[model samples]
Target: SAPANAVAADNATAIALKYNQDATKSERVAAARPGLPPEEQHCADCQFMQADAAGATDEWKGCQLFPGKLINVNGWCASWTLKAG
Candidate 1:
């Protein structure tokens, strides 16, 4: 099996925040992005998605909401917010 870098769906933060590795089915509000496609609302495109530090793996990135645990680049959650320009 692969490393458990990504936070599990059952984690307190994940359950409370309704995080989902697949945005296609995520509980994240699609209406949050007016006139935009759902594909553009994933974690990879959110402000909370952070680049992995030196020791972190390349496959998954970290989420500001779920500290210490990695989140999928394609993941989505209720807290999804557009990154700043």
Candidate 2:
């Protein structure tokens, strides 16, 4: 457990990024009661969402709607959708 704690401490930067990203997502989603075109637009399922080439395992992902911003995979915004097969 001690080793795990140390590893976590080393990842402080990544941890803080996730926290801030999630907070931003939470705040924006609650601000407008935004339209749910199809009810529920999860980042995991949205076309705009993608795993970063360098951080493929990260929970915070990239979104087309907001360039250069990382968003929680479970978060949603106004512009989201399924990609064409």
Question: Alpha-carbon error at 82 in model 1, in Å?
Answer: 0.3
Q: Output the lDDT of residue 44, model 1.
A: 77
Say which candidate scores most in lDDT: 1
Tens-digit lDDT string for candidate 2 (1-85): 1211111212454353232333344333443333343334466776666675234344666655544455566655444556542
Name model 1 segments beyond 4 Å from true.
Answer: 29-35, 54-58
| Residue 50 displacement in candidate 1 (angstroms) | 0.4
Most accurate candidate by TM-score:
1
Runs of candidate 2 with Cα error greater than 4 angstroms are 1-40, 53-57
Residue pairs in clash, model 2 = none
Question: For residues 24-83, what per-residue lDDT tens digits would candidate 1 score against the true structure?
Answer: 888455446643566668887788778853235555788888776788778888887778
- Angstrom error at residue 79, model 1: 0.1
